[PDB]
């Protein structure tokens, strides 16, 4: 098989997957949803114990075996081969949820090309009766139904949720978003068609640009008057609501989606080169840079929110309460509309979001494309381009049902149900298979001399008890706590809750059904069946 070549492209790819628009969206959103300051204190130890061991162990396993992501299990535990299809379905769902955000971001980038951005005021295609958020000389009387120009732009222009009365009501089509998704899919298909060479070559040009745009946006937002209330609200200890009913589980899920363990991308990036004496270093640096960029995004978001609250002369905890994922697209839009240096900051921020989401979804799709090819050699021989075209077709077919519907309700449902308990159970079964079933002693007896140092006394005790204990605790809390959802003054009905629970349960039923298929295809009694089926080849 081919190799990554030079370590620089591999490091760039890992850090590019680390910097994720999904994380930049979810971290400050749930932060402000739970209360802001009471989100970072019970977060650091969970982030460490969820990212460091899983990422490091999976990178080491990939660099040691080099058999893709699905075929890498044939030499460890062939009973749990269904995890390949599980993570494939998970990646399909995550891509279907990411495509709508990508289309929204690119449509915003297109609409932000005119000299007069359509955010300072409401034009002939917006409800001016409720469009009254204009900073005047104390002549505004906010009521229980007042809205914002950016809110109207996100609601009745790009989404048109006014035509849909919920999930049970069908919504109108959107040709603009349709062509946007078409263009995004052709771009990503032309990007993946070449191969791992252009994969590693395309990350370097899109590596420092998001960082520099983030830095200039931060130094621009930190200068506006009102950058103190935001940071004071973001840096509150708040030791009152963190014991049991806090945001610990949501923070765990957020850092899980950020680090991306078990998503197949790590095994994909490690199945190319051995990367001697640098696996632990790369894992540590990518984890700390992901934590740093997430912290910086949350910091700048809360700074802009505090600035807006001080400009509006209102408390920070009441602006955009019921707003879901719109928070970014509304607050940053209002900030750029208020900034006298517009028409440039919005463009560079939209370009940042576009390239970030592109590299994220590209790595996510490659992590499945290079695994299914290793699983099917008759396809990997010649039909690679045909299969990637077919997977692009099926991905856009799956994303059509959530794009053409014209409603963010299914988007929020997938955001709160697809990247949660299913991938949590996937990570749990992967960890228990690599720790309990597969001997940790013989697992480390090679990676020790492979990386030069001894991983003992930390992972020998972390991979066995505390990590699976925390995983099972998070999973049980998720299964026991009913995930109530609200978005744009719309309560999710019990039928939608049941549908979400059913899709979350069936998203990982492939692993137990494959276990059943294996135990019914293996002859003999149960004892000899298991003891001759779970054999590392």
């Amino acid at each position, epitope marked *: 098989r081919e190799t990554w070549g030079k370590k620089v492209d591999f490091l760039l790819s890992v850090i590019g997957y680390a910097v994720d628009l999904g994380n930049v969206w979810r971290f400050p959103y749930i932060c402000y949803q739970n209360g802001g300051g009471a989100f970072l204190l019970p977060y650091t130890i969970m982030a460490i114990f969820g990212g460091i061991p899983l990422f490091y162990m999976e990178l080491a396993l990939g660099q040691y075996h080099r058999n893709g992501c699905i075929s890498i299990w044939r030499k460890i535990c062939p009973i749990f081969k269904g995890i390949g299809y599980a993570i494939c379905i998970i990646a399909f769902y995550i891509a279907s949820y990411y495509n709508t955000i990508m289309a929204w971001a690119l449509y915003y980038l297109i609409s932000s090309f005119t000299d007069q951005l359509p955010w300072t*005021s*409401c*034009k*002939n*295609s*917006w*409800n*001016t*009766g*409720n*469009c*009254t958020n*204009y900073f005047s000389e104390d002549n505004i009387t906010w009521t229980l139904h007042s809205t914002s120009p950016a809110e*109207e732009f996100y609601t*009745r*222009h790009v989404l*048109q949720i*006014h*035509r849909s009365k919920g999930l049970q009501d069908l919504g*109108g089509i959107s040709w603009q978003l349709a062509l946007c998704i078409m263009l995004i899919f052709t771009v990503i298909y032309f990007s993946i068609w070449k191969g791992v060479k252009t994969s590693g070559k395309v990350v370097w040009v899109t590596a420092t640009f998001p960082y520099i745009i983030l830095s200039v946006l931060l130094v621009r937002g930190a200068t506006l008057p009102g950058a103190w209330r935001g940071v004071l609200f973001y840096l509150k200890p708040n030791w009152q609501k963190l014991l049991e009913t806090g945001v610990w589980i949501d923070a765990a899920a957020q850092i899980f989606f950020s680090l991306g363990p078990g998503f197949g991308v790590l095994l994909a990036f490690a199945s190319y080169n051995k990367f001697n004496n640098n696996c632990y270093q790369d894992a540590l640096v990518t984890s700390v840079v992901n934590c740093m960029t997430s912290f910086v995004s949350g910091f700048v978001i809360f700074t802009v929110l505090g600035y807006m609250a001080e400009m509006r002369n209102e408390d920070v905890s009441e602006v955009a309460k019921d707003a879901g994922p719109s928070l970014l697209f509304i607050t940053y839009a209002e900030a750029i509309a208020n900034m006298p240096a517009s028409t440039f900051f919005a463009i560079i921020f939209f370009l940042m979001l576009i390239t970030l989401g592109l590299d994220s979804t590209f790595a996510g799709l490659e992590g499945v494309i290079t695994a299914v090819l290793d699983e099917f050699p008759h396809v990997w021989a010649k039909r690679r381009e045909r299969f990637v075209l077919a997977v692009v077709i099926t991905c856009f077919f799956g994303s059509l049902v959530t794009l053409t519907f014209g409603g963010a309700y299914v988007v929020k449902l997938l955001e709160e149900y697809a990247t949660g308990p299913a991938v949590l159970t996937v990570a749990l079964i992967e960890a228990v298979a690599v720790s309990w079933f597969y001997g940790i002693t013989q697992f480390c007896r090679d990676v020790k001399e492979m990386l030069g140092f001894s991983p003992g006394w930390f992972w020998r005790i972390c991979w066995v008890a505390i990590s699976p204990l925390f995983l099972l605790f998070i999973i049980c809390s998720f299964l026991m706590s009913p995930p109530q959802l609200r978005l744009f003054q719309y309560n999710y009905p019990y039928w939608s809750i049941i549908l979400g629970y059913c899709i979350g349960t069936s998203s990982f039923i492939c692993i137990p059904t494959y276990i059943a298929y294996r135990l019914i295809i293996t002859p003999g009694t149960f004892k000899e069946r298991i003891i001759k089926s779970i054999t590392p080849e």
Partner: antibody
Amino acid sequence: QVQLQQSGPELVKLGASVRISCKASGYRFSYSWMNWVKQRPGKGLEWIGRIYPGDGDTKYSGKFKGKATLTADKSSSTVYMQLSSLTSEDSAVYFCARSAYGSEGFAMDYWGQGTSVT
Amino acid sequence: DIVLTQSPASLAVSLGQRATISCRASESVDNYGISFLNWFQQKPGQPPKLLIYAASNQGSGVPARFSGSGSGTYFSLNIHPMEEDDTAVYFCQQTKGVSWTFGGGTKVEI
């Protein structure tokens, strides 16, 4: 409410200029558009242009951008229409209508008494 | 530009019968599920009066006899049998961007 009071009649001369005022009150005039129509005696209606108070945005059309100009005044809550090269063709009555909101379809619900510019 | 054409030009409908007014164009003014169309009532000497809101809802203070429907390109203005006082020239307005244009006009009588 209905308080779109306009000015009285004026005299039209060849190569002149007349200003028509439109006093708006009773609602948020700085958030709704201000439309101006042109009706000839014994003819239909002709749209001149629109103006958005508080922002200065104007959209002139209907071969009238060369001789018609709209001006808003947030202090006096009045709308002014600048004219030029007055002729017997454009010498007719002019109204001052206020458009509706977005969900209402931007309809001219409120009108004025009329300004007979003859 | 977007020009409107009305038909018919004159409707001498007697008292006790309904009538219909059409306003055709190249639009297709449908945008965000809101039919961009406005119907006005112009009386001789009196200023115009709004009748239908976005060609779907009735105006403010207007009688229940006024109604209107239609979508896409063709639009119908179905009016209940009126009296000798509701006779007035009606106009259709296209409020879609970026320019606004009025209709031709109808001459309803007995």
